[PDB]
Paper text:
At the axonal surface, type IIa receptor protein tyrosine phosphatases (RPTPs) (type IIa RPTPs, for example, [name]σ, [name]δ and leukocyte common antigen-related (LAR) in vertebrates, dLAR in Drosophila), are a recently identified nexus for extracellular interactions, receiving signals and transmitting them intracellularly to the cytoskeleton to regulate neuronal extension and guidance, as well as synaptic organization. There are two major neuronal [name]σ isoforms, sharing a common intracellular catalytic region and an extracellular region predicted to contain three immunoglobulin (Ig)-like domains followed by either five or nine fibronectin (FN) type III domains, in the central and peripheral nervous systems, respectively. Previous mutagenesis and structural studies have demonstrated that the proteoglycan-binding site lies on Ig1 of [name]σ, and comprises an extended positively charged surface of basic residues101314. Binding of postsynaptic [name], is reported to require the N-terminal three Ig domains of [name]σ17; the NGL-3-binding site has been mapped to the FN1-2 domains.
To facilitate crystallization, a chicken [name] construct ([name] LRRIg1cryst) was generated, which removed putative sites of N-linked glycosylation and residues 63–77, a predicted disordered loop. A 2.5Å crystal structure of a chicken [name]σ Ig1–2:[name] LRRIg1cryst complex was determined, revealing a 1:1 stoichiometry, in agreement with results from multi-angle light scattering (MALS) analysis. The structure is consistent with a trans [name]σ:[name] complex spanning the synaptic cleft. The V-shaped [name]σ Ig1–2 module contacts an extended [name] surface consisting of the LRR convex face and Ig1 domain, with a buried surface area of 1,093 Å2 per molecule. Three major contact sites constitute the protein–protein interface in the complex crystal structure: site 1, [name]σ Ig1:[name] Ig1; site 2, [name]σ Ig1:[name] LRRIg1 inter-domain region and site 3, [name]σ Ig2:[name] LRR. Electrostatic interactions involving [name]σ residues R96 and R99 and [name] residues D240 and D242 dominate interactions at site 1. At site 2, Q75 in [name]σ, interacts with [name] residues E287 and Q148, while the side chains of [name]σ E78 and [name] R121 form a salt bridge. Site 3 centres on a K203–E100 salt bridge between [name]σ and [name] residues, respectively. [name]σ:[name] crystal structures provide an explanation for the specificity of this interaction and also highlight an overlap of [name] and proteoglycan-binding sites on [name]σ.
Author numbering:
A (entry chain C): 29 to 67, 72 to 227
B (entry chain A): 29 to 62, 78 to 257, 262 to 304
The structure:
Amino acid sequence: ESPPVFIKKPVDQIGVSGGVASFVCQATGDPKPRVTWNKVNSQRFETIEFDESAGAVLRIQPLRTPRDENIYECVAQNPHGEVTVHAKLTVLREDQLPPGFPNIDMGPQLKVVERTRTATMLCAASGNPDPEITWFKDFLPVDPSTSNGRIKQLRSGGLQIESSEETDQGKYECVASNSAGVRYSSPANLYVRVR
Amino acid sequence: ETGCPANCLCSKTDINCKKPDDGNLFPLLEGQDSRNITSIHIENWKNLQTLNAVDMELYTGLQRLTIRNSGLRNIQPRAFAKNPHLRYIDLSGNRLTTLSWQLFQTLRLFDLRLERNPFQCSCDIRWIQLWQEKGEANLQSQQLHCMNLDTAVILLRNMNITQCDLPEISVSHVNLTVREGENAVITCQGSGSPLPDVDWTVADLHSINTHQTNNVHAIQLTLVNVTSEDNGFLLTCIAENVVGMSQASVLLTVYGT
Ligand SMILES: *[C@@H]1O[C@H](CO)[C@@H](O)[C@H](O)[C@H]1NC(C)=O
Ligand SMILES: *[C@@H]1O[C@H](CO)[C@@H](O)[C@H](O)[C@H]1NC(C)=O
Ligand SMILES: *[C@@H]1O[C@H](CO)[C@@H](O)[C@H](O)[C@H]1NC(C)=O
């Protein structure tokens, strides 16, 4: 028996009007905890659950300003306690973007790989400071450590998937972040074919 | 060697997988022949529980989808966003406990088959009752059932959810004229139970525009430094809940140099 602890705290997001923002929370505990997001029901606000409902992403798309600017709350619960963490959304207009706001120079493309073959999804971005690239698959952050060793994030920013398996199939997007804000590429699907 | 997926039959326009299959992945055709596929028929797939967008997106020419007497429990949001010609959908004989009209918002459906699914009676399927009554997509012909939380099973036509109807909508102005270079403000508001979401679907507007919130959900649209290129633009507002959708519009007129 043990109460809920967040092993993923959501982080503040500064997005662009028309774009995407995501907040991730995930909680551990015994019994396994259940998490939920909070603040009306909208297609533009989507909750994607994971880890048997002990994790959840709140994904907002397309972003609207100023109406979407808010503090969003993720609450985690089990029979030994209830706990909450917060995160802030700012949304800039296209005409308000500072000079070094992350830019996607070339995004991922549609790809088909044969099962067991290696596959690399490409992403290249620029901005100031130099932007940090992370990857999302089926609206979920990709975690290399659970792949495991099988999947690497390259220095160039590509996602390298060795020994392709059926669960590697899905919709990928790369996300470029820096102190100015966050920018999503267009999505690209990776298909895994037989043999 | 064929590209055709195991235990299906393929022609240049059709894919049929009707023999009992234990697999849980949706059948993917291998090749760029995908956009010319107009008909996909799946039946007796007891382990096919979910349908993802990624499975549907290659079949851009699809017109007819049958997933029948299989294990289908749910369909991801926007699964059919890239199948705009899809006008016939059969989901009968599956394990669907609920279904959202939003899956179908971009389609013009002639036939949607929902018989022999274990629906739970809730406000999330009020729309189905409504489509039945207004004769939409041949739902009027079908005998669907749903279950109450006390386990009583009823005909859908006897379902009686209170405080659960179509959203209403209004706008502050019938038309709007503005001088080039100036601002303008207008409001759209939705009402009803449950409370609708409200959006100005106005992305193709060239002028800078901001959306601010104000038992009624109201969004103010601010136009700033308006340009002549938006003259004659129809400013559209939409009001959505789980039951359905209402639309309202304001004609924009821009004069000056
Ligand atoms: C699919 O159909 C289109 C037009 O009908 C044509 O351009 C294309 O070559 C066809 N593809 C195949 C594989 O036959
Ligand atoms: C349905 O029952 C509710 C009370 O639970 C009531 O609001 C409504 O008048 C009833 N309508 C019908 C047709 O039974
Ligand atoms: C407004 O738009 C005009 C025309 O594009 C542009 O040249 C100008 O910089 C803007 N002026 C103001 C006051 O916003």
